[PDB]
Amino acid sequence: VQVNKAAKKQKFTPEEDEMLKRAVAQHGSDWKMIAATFPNRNARQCRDRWKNYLAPSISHTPWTAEEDALLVQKIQEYGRQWAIIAKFFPGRTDIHIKNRWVTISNKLGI
DNA sequence: AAATATCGTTAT
DNA sequence: ATAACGATATTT
Question: Which residues form a coiled coil (predicted)?
Fold first, then answer.
């Protein structure tokens, strides 16, 4: 977050995360209204944080070797269509799938 | 160099 | 409005 002059990546703090979870319980998916309550956040930032990190359906367990194996197979099947591929991974979104491909492609020496 | 949450931008 | 994906910045 904020500085280092202003960081070009502003990370959500644990407190903002708590805030966001409350705002969603209160306003649902009205991202503009939600973001109005965050002085340094816009609608896009709140939506992304919720959808990919805070939503109760998101997995916070490490990637398993079975999941990795599925990813290599699904990418042979679908190519770089991350949103489609993420359908097959309960608790993971396209954001997670495309990050994981970088890491997997490293292990495979690609 | 590697890992990964965030951001620029386009297409839906 | 927001889903989608490349690409980046930050930290290790």
Answer: none
Experimental determination approach used: X-ray
Q: What residue has token string 């269509």? A: A81
Domains of chain A: 1-60 (1.10.10.60), 61-110 (1.10.10.60)
A6 Cβ contacts chain B strand, under 7 Å: no
What is the rounded distance in angstroms from the CA atom of residue A104 to the CA atom of residue A66?
A: 12
Rounded-to-integer distance, Cα A23 and Cα A98, Å: 28
Q: What is the resolution of this structure in A?
A: 2.0
Chain B bases closer than 7 angstroms to a protein Cβ? 2-7, 9
CB-contacted nucleotides of strand C (7 Å): 1-11
In chain A, DSSP assigns E strands to: none
Q: Which of A52, A63, A53 is nearest to A104 (CA)?
A: A63
